[PDB]
Amino acid sequence: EVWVVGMGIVMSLIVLAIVFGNVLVITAIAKFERLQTVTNYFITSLACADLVMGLAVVPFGAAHILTKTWTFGNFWCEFWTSIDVLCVTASIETLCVIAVDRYFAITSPFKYQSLLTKNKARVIILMVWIVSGLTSFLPIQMHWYRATHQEAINCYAEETCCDFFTNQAYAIASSIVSFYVPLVIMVFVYSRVFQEAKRQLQKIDKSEGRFEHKALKTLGIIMGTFTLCWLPFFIVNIVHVIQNLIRKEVYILLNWIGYVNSGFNPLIYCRSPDFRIAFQELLC
């Protein structure tokens, strides 16, 4: 039987990867004064969200999957669900804020210096987490998301069962707040940035005539590891409520595909040469 020892190894490796990467990024930004920049506060917020997710959400879900029972109390089921939703929405919204910051950096270069002051770059982060917590903790803990049918009531009345059942309203509102609004903004921002880059290369070629792969590669790496990781989940999240069409195993698998996005963020964003120097100093 390889379906007990085997899936544990993969889950443990995911936990180790997430924890190691996020801890390294956080300590590199904290220890070195050169890396302290307005752009790097969004990165440290994202790293904090990913580290919390890797420490809390993944291990208990892994234990639940491997054991098929919930030994802990009934309070901890709702606490764990609330933490899961909070971390996911905070991470995605920080990803949106980073793209908006880059839009403001390239599109308007003269007014960028005054706009993103270090003092005003903290209110944005404090608002992101508050908005994340107003949709994660408050609706779940007040018991406003609860479903109404025999399976849901039986699940809620048992102390060893912890499965996600939700209404139509909460599912739709949660998906809209967490995914689609932060997606349209990123699409618009990155399209405009690509346009500006193309114009710049056109000017260079027209000027130094005698003597778009990079932009496409960078935008593909940024926007193909996010849509592919999170888009499949937020469609079944609506479908399984509108209509038996979606089975539970597919839902759980598509949920767990979106968790590994936390382990890839340091590769995508913490790739500058200064980060490489800082990582070299810390480890070796």
Ligand SMILES: CN[C@@H]1CCc2c(ccc(O)c2O)[C@H]1O
């Ligand atoms: C238990 N897993 C949850 C279920 C629903 C949900 C998640 C993440 C973000 C949301 O906006 C959600 O509505 C998932 O992490």
